[PDB]
Motif scaffolding. Sequence first.
Motif, mmCIF file in Angstrom:
data_model
loop_
_atom_site.group_PDB
_atom_site.id
_atom_site.type_symbol
_atom_site.label_atom_id
_atom_site.label_comp_id
_atom_site.label_asym_id
_atom_site.label_seq_id
_atom_site.Cartn_x
_atom_site.Cartn_y
_atom_site.Cartn_z
ATOM 1 N N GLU A 1 7.993 -9.877 2.116
ATOM 2 C CA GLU A 1 6.628 -9.977 1.597
ATOM 3 C C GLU A 1 6.621 -10.741 0.269
ATOM 4 O O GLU A 1 5.821 -11.652 0.073
ATOM 5 C CB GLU A 1 5.982 -8.589 1.494
ATOM 6 N N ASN B 1 4.722 3.187 8.140
ATOM 7 C CA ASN B 1 5.228 4.288 7.337
ATOM 8 C C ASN B 1 4.091 5.156 6.784
ATOM 9 O O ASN B 1 4.334 6.269 6.326
ATOM 10 C CB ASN B 1 6.083 3.743 6.198
ATOM 11 N N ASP C 1 15.515 7.756 6.321
ATOM 12 C CA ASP C 1 16.271 7.437 7.528
ATOM 13 C C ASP C 1 15.576 7.877 8.816
ATOM 14 O O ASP C 1 16.101 7.593 9.890
ATOM 15 C CB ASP C 1 17.699 7.991 7.487
ATOM 16 N N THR D 1 0.817 -1.207 0.000
ATOM 17 C CA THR D 1 0.000 0.000 0.000
ATOM 18 C C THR D 1 0.856 1.264 0.000
ATOM 19 O O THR D 1 0.344 2.326 -0.283
ATOM 20 C CB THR D 1 -0.967 0.072 1.191
ATOM 21 N N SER D 2 2.150 1.166 0.315
ATOM 22 C CA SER D 2 3.027 2.322 0.306
ATOM 23 C C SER D 2 3.215 2.845 -1.122
ATOM 24 O O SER D 2 3.363 4.052 -1.321
ATOM 25 C CB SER D 2 4.325 1.977 0.967
ATOM 26 N N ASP E 1 4.870 8.962 5.794
ATOM 27 C CA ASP E 1 5.008 9.144 4.355
ATOM 28 C C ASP E 1 4.084 10.268 3.905
ATOM 29 O O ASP E 1 4.488 11.113 3.119
ATOM 30 C CB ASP E 1 4.658 7.884 3.547
HETATM 31 N N1 ANP Z 1 15.695 4.568 3.787
HETATM 32 C C1 ANP Z 1 14.477 4.628 4.350
HETATM 33 N N2 ANP Z 1 14.264 5.347 5.489
HETATM 34 C C2 ANP Z 1 13.039 5.397 6.017
HETATM 35 N N3 ANP Z 1 11.925 4.812 5.598
HETATM 36 C C3 ANP Z 1 12.162 4.098 4.454
HETATM 37 C C4 ANP Z 1 13.383 3.958 3.792
HETATM 38 N N4 ANP Z 1 13.233 3.157 2.668
HETATM 39 C C5 ANP Z 1 11.938 2.831 2.674
HETATM 40 N N5 ANP Z 1 11.244 3.366 3.734
HETATM 41 C C6 ANP Z 1 9.843 3.218 4.050
HETATM 42 O O1 ANP Z 1 9.393 1.923 3.703
HETATM 43 C C7 ANP Z 1 8.189 2.063 2.915
HETATM 44 C C8 ANP Z 1 8.012 0.898 1.969
HETATM 45 O O2 ANP Z 1 7.926 -0.309 2.738
HETATM 46 P P1 ANP Z 1 7.223 -1.606 2.115
HETATM 47 O O3 ANP Z 1 7.456 -2.697 3.083
HETATM 48 O O4 ANP Z 1 7.693 -1.739 0.694
HETATM 49 O O5 ANP Z 1 5.674 -1.121 2.197
HETATM 50 P P2 ANP Z 1 4.432 -1.765 1.437
HETATM 51 O O6 ANP Z 1 4.813 -3.140 1.108
HETATM 52 O O7 ANP Z 1 4.179 -0.941 0.147
HETATM 53 N N6 ANP Z 1 3.146 -1.693 2.438
HETATM 54 P P3 ANP Z 1 2.202 -2.971 2.827
HETATM 55 O O8 ANP Z 1 1.082 -3.098 1.897
HETATM 56 O O9 ANP Z 1 1.733 -2.790 4.303
HETATM 57 O O10 ANP Z 1 3.245 -4.130 2.819
HETATM 58 C C9 ANP Z 1 8.356 3.385 2.200
HETATM 59 O O11 ANP Z 1 7.112 3.932 1.739
HETATM 60 C C10 ANP Z 1 9.013 4.227 3.259
HETATM 61 O O12 ANP Z 1 8.008 4.775 4.129
#
Ligand code: ANP
Lengths: 352, 361
Positions: free
Chosen positions: B324, B185, B203, B11-12, B189
């Motif tokens: 995942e 996040n 970070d 969802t990110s 975000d």
């Molecule tokens: N270097 C970093 N520092 C801080 N936050 C980060 C960094 N890199 C990635 N992120 C965070 O990690 C998020 C992506 O994580 P991710 O596990 O891919 O989420 P997702 O899979 O899209 N969500 P979901 O559907 O719940 O699994 C990004 O949107 C950021 O908020």
Amino acid sequence: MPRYLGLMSGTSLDGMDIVLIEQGDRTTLLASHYLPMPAGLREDILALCVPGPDEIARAAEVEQRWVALAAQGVRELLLQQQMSPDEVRAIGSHGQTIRHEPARHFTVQIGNPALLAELTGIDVVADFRRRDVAAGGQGAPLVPAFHQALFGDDDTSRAVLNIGGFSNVSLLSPGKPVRGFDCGPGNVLMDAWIHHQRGEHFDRDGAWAASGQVNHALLASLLADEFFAFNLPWLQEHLARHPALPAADIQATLLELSARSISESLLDAQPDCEEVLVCGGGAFNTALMKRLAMLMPEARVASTDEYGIPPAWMEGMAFAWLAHRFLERLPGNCPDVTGALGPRTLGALYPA
Amino acid sequence: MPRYLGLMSGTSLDGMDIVLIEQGDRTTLLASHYLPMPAGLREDILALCVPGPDEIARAAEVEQRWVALAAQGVRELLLQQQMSPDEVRAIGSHGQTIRHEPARHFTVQIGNPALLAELTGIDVVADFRRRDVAAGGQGAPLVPAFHQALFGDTSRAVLNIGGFSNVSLLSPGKPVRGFDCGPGNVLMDAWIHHQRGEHFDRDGAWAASGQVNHALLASLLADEFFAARGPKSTGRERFNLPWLQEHLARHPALPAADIQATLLELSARSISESLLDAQPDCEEVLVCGGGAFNTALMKRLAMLMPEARVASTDEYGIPPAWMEGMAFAWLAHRFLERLPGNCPDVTGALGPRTLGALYPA
Ligand SMILES: Nc1ncnc2c1ncn2[C@@H]1O[C@H](COP(=O)(O)OP(=O)(O)NP(=O)(O)O)[C@@H](O)[C@H]1O
Ligand SMILES: Nc1ncnc2c1ncn2[C@@H]1O[C@H](COP(=O)(O)OP(=O)(O)NP(=O)(O)O)[C@@H](O)[C@H]1O
Ligand SMILES: [Mg+2]
Ligand SMILES: [Mg+2]
């Protein structure tokens, strides 16, 4: 030899057909069961067939009601036949089309197959159309391959005409590829007009169309439509640029439009046709069948009843067959007919 | 020794995860391939996450573009790894969630599996959540089953911090439990994207600068999702920007970085309390997903959970980013072996079920 359920709900929205077939070297109908579509759900499905708000939530709710109904009807049928769920290898479900746009590369049949597996305890195969479309095709018709198997007479030039909403035909000519195209509208304008006018669903026995006089100017303009080289507003458009006409005369005409679009297209491609085998709910429109018989005088016109299989269940039986085809990994499309790039395994498997 | 592809886009909306695994006596990661999400597609998917007009055509067109980018990814990885599609038994495709409402008994993930099988020439297992929802569940999280098989003496907590946070509680002896803790996040975000252009606070740098606000902190916690025990999928309260601005509006004005710092704390805390409630015996907190590359958030969870060690999954030989994806490749295995996919006490479904559907090449 394995047993299959077929679940058909066509775009005329009349009801759910459930068939029990057996697939040996022969397909055979063991039993059938009809669920008339309830008033609320029909209109709700209808209101998904045009663009509008909140469709994803709304489709999810409709879907749930459609499936609970399908599952109710499967159970009813098994109990009445004294059969366990485990005597069925799988359900072949067409779902319900709410959008078909092969020019934009998509077609949408709702039908939460996974809930259907949950509620029936039987494996489901659904979502037949999308792979044909993914392959460069129209995702329709899917019935022509089934017609060939079920009628394999390397003797006569048979022609299998399905009249639902739309008329589509399968031409079975000895020792050749099967062909398929859309003739034109089947019941769809006739339903639409007697629905707009009175509130009825269809014109029983083609009675209203039979009590009216054919208009030739209207008819000529209708037949002159580009398609041959189909909803109420399309027909209200044509009703503009003509005299005002009595309701019955428009129905009569609509019925002639169906019969002529069929007639021309079918001897235009298979002119030496011995047998036109009618299936679908248009077979019951006695008045339309009369006209088909006259416009095809030197051909035997009749329903598939004459050759062993009741016309209302043809499509139900085909989707049972497509479940079989899927599981045997045998193509379910005819690319010559669909425009697909080739033979494709059609469907997805939702295991119980 | 079957190989499977895993396809994840959470969802990110950061991008698509493509992983290749070998399934034997365990799961070994062979390769990873990340695709950045085109800014066009990202916004078009976000536009489908709220009710709107013409959603069926819109989503059908978005799905085409999503599947095109996914197959491009698969083809690239295979070529780059000098393998042909035949060598892969199946792709496990998560799809992209546009509407998750277990309370309305539905979850909608798009990603036309028939067109994905067409474009890759590989069998596709897709649509994993719907059978679990059909049998009464929340349809999520689905990773616990996998977390158990990876990391199942030790009372372990396996923590995904993506958009949202989910925790698998691996209690030796007891059933596998766990639930969506809530915001990972997602809010941090969304705040840094409202205030500025970028999609995430690299970070936790912005967050760390600021200072938490205890009044705001105390309110956001005061929310109906948080007290709920057992089977819950994030969205019993929709943690989103409108959710926050409301809360901002009922307080006096504050600095942006402070708000970020407070959001950071809200994720750390909801995790701590929800996690510890259910497993105070917990010894290790294993952290995956992008939230593990957030230095601030990681250091802070450590503190909130002192009686246990808080380390990302790379130290147990699994990069956080690909957990995942590996889980959806593994779900295709489970589907193809007819082995259960869900953990019912996690999801709250009636019992175990094989999840997904097969779209064969
Ligand atoms: N270097 C970093 N520092 C801080 N936050 C980060 C960094 N890199 C990635 N992120 C965070 O990690 C998020 C992506 O994580 P991710 O596990 O891919 O989420 P997702 O899979 O899209 N969500 P979901 O559907 O719940 O699994 C990004 O949107 C950021 O908020
Ligand atoms: N006794 C009858 N008299 C006149 N028309 C009838 C009669 N019985 C059925 N029909 C027509 O047959 C239609 C239903 O045919 P059916 O083959 O079920 O169409 P469909 O559901 O749209 N399937 P499809 O061809 O896949 O689109 C009804 O809507 C009526 O128009
Ligand atoms: Mg029908
Ligand atoms: Mg992600």
